[PDB]
Amino acid sequence: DQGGYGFAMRLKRRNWYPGAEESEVKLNESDWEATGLPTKPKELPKRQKSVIEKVETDGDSDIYSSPYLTPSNAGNGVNQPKNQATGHENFQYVYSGWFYKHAASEKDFSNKKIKSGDDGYIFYHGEKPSRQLPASGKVIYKGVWHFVTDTKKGQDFREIIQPSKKQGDRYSGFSGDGSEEYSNKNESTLKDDHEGYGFTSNLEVDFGNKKLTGKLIRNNASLNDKHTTQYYSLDAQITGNRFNGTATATDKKENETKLHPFVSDSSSLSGGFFGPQGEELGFRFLSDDQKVAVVGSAKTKDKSKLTTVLDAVELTLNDKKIKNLDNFSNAAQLVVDGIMIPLLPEFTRKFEHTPETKTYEVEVCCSNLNYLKYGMLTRKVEQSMFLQGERTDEKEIPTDQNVVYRGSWYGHIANGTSWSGNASDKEGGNRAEFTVNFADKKITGKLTAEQTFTIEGMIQGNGFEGTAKTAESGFDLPKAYITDAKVKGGFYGPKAEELGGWFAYPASSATVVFGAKRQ
């Protein structure tokens, strides 16, 4: 999809003012809200929490939330419910769940509006979207899932929520409702075929084939023979640290009458992997009939060769240091300080951006690159270089023994006075060239200002590493000297049409990002 740390969807409340009544309020893709990056995934997402904090109540002011979440800033009663897939409960990077208030009714006759029922959100959010994943093998992920429905006059979902308060009619059915009383979430022990407590998810992720399948079920209250009910299966393709696909409603029958909301397929399943090697994931979807939205989370068993799916780095000038950036496997979306900066609105480019550090100044290259972006980033005053690209699958690395790549680079170097040079297509300005022997796992090339650097390295999988050096001789602006500069890079896009890398040093310094295109 379009990437992000998380998504939230608000409960609906239907207007029943007589004469001005909405017979229905459907859910919409436009209803999804970004959560932003959480400092602590176990806490509620801050933007949406603030909204609910301001929601008026009249008798019970508490915020109720999923049992494994941090009550934080909020209270409860008659409470020890559980919602967990057994053996898969120790989430560290990703949380999904719900939170809500018993909101006061809106009783605004003078605006012909009457609304009543809970107000709240379902959501998932995560930190540390993954830059590496297992290289191969099928891996079981389990966790939880949550839902919120549309509202329609006369509608009920009595199979999942006892409809004494018009759940599904006046306000959304949702998995946190006080009348969701048919799961085993309050029971003290499990039946031998339960996957856990409440609504749980089970996914099989095939890292070898870049795809996944799964099942979303309810673990049923024991009030012979089977004690779970399946509402969806899932199917998705993995691209980098993201996945996209479909959800299939398990019981839609034909003839109905359909006492639950899970009756339509979804063509908008999307999620992503989080953690050092994608050991946790978050996902969401919206049903095609706009009657239900789902979010969820899953993880490998509570306590392997890896492949790198992306590079995203920031090189800070002042201290020549190199930090990893978050990225959602999208070279054209620059993620810094938890905000997303697009990189496409003519070689290179330049612009500034302010969200909602004051503003970000970015110079990005290049116009002919599609899986790789690099340039200059400045906060306001801080200055850095950056590079980010989507690695080519190691199994797609071409075998060709002679391959030339051409492009440019941004440079900042000094043994005394400093030299800085942007990237360019012309003329004697920064230019880069590389010859790669894939068969040999060998790579070499040169960067020239017009004087030059010379790079050499070997090829490990879908990335390379080596060293860069001035002529020394020396450089320009009066001379700078570089020797044994630590060089890191990778190949980007299908069959490695693109490649790029960077180096920092380490009385001469140096920080360089470069990217080249295949001929």
Add this chain to the structure above:
Amino acid sequence: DQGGYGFAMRLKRRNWYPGAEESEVKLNESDWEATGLPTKPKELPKRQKSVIEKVETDGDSDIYSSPYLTPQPKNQATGHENFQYVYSGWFYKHAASEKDFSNKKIKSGDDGYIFYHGEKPSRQLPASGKVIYKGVWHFVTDTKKGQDFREIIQPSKKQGDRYSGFSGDGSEEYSNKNESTLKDDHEGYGFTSNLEVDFGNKKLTGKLIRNNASLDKHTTQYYSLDAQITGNRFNGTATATDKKENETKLHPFVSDSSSLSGGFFGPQGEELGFRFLSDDQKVAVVGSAKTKDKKLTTVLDAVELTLNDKKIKNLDNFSNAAQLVVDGIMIPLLPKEFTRKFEHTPETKTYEVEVCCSNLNYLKYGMLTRKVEQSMFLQGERTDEKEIPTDQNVVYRGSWYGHIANGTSWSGNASDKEGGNRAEFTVNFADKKITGKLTAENTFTIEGMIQGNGFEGTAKTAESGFDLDPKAYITDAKVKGGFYGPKAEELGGWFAYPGASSATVVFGAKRQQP
């Protein structure tokens, strides 16, 4: 009717909670509320005012009322605006909505009352002639879902549907009440009344109209009225002038009423108040009217004779001998067996009353005590002067209550027996002459002239002293009285002395027959 100083009727608000909705709330005779005696007729009636004071608001706490009432529209019949005894009108609040969702009650709209009240209900009226009364009238309707009265009230706020149509509504915008001058054929401003009272024939007729805003005849008539006068009261019907024929009826005045009732107030009934409820229970009306701004007959006697100070006060009465009105409260004299005795506490602590007699129907008299004060009382409904019989020899027999003393006091209740208090009278109507005797122990002698339905003369202990079981010498004591009931079957009088022996006496006798 059943008499009173005034009546009020509250606006209705209809429950429109979905699923627990009232489709309609009709008016009912039982909805009428007594107002009590006002100290100042220009002020709002106190009981109902207190109710409205407690009505909850949320944004506008004011009480709005008819412009001539004591807190630039006008509501008045020109030349007939200076009311002193009787006021009718309305008052209300922009009441907050009731929004009780868990008990399934939603109500919205104005809350308030229409009312009339008066002081000094009349004991005399003009003896004859037709007299024009004009004034104002007011209405409140039922509520019914989907109902509007757009001819009278612009229905932007569901007037007639969620809360009663009423003449004080802010959207009553079709009368001339806000205009600065009058058309040639307007009777005045807003909704006005015009009555012709025929005191000669004891009846009245009238018309209730709206004076229309000018933006072709300028008034619209909604009712005519017809009533019979009995004493200081009147009862009859209202006839809806436009009912239902070729029209779908854009106003609430579509049904007749068989419950028009009202009464006269002031020294000679120069003002009146009235009310009615439509037979279809869709609309209640109250109103008031007066003779133009600036010989009598007496229709009732109602007096209190205070012992301690031998003084005699007029009581209010609504032309009903069996309803004793003291201190603004109504005390019935027949239990819904000669003489009677009982006590009564309203809502002075309690009233103790001894009343006579069981055979009298237009005349009641006896003892009244407050708690401690003690008085005698007499009240009766005079016979029409034109019904005074011409018979030259007529005997009346009965009793009397007596309290007298030149030294020690003598008190004697009334009775049928035996040597106890007894009264006898012979009346020569042809001669306009009356005489009779009261005896305790076998004594007062009374001569008097008849005038209309009343008499006036003297009572003397004669010669000399009386008993005191010490001689009490009362002579030339003024005696006043009347003939009560149709054709003067019952008669009554009283006397106070002086105008070392005192005396206060009420008596009543009944007519005999060959």
